[PDB]
Amino acid sequence: PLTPNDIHNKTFTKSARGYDEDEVNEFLAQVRKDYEIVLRKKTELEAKVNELDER
Amino acid sequence: PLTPNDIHNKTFTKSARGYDEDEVNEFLAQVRKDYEIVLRKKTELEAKVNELDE
Numbered sequence: 353p354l355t356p357n358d359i360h361n362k363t364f365t366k367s368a369r370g371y372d373e374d375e376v377n378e379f380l381a382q383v384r385k386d387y388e389i390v391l392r393k394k395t396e397l398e399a400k401v402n403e404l405d406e407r
Numbered sequence: 408p409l410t411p412n413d414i415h416n417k418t419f420t421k422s423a424r425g426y427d428e429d430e431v432n433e434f435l436a437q438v439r440k441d442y443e444i445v446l447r448k449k450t451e452l453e454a455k456v457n458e459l460d461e
Contacts, residue, residue, distance in 0.1 A: 364427055372422040401456065
């Protein structure tokens with residue numbers, strides 16, 4: 353799946369008419385934040401479960 | 408925080424020489440799916456871990 357850095361690094365073509373760039377970038381910053389937070393929680397929990405199963 | 412639905416529902420003001428809408432829409436669709444799946448996996452894992460000791 354996408355990484356937080358993938359979201360941060362994503363670029364788009366500019367068209368004669370398109371989505372306001374500042375709005376898109378701000379929204380993607382927000383998505384990147386929330387995604388990274390949930391991803392980290394998931395990976396941290398997985399690591400503790402793995403560690404316990406491994407003993 | 409955002410929900411996956413919020414990402415699907417997000418609208419942007421149009422502007423001259425803004426980002427191509429198909430490209431942004433396509434990327435947001437990919438992000439929406441990956442975000443939905445990771446949220447689901449995290450929520451399921453947390454629930455199940457808390458069910459281990461009966």
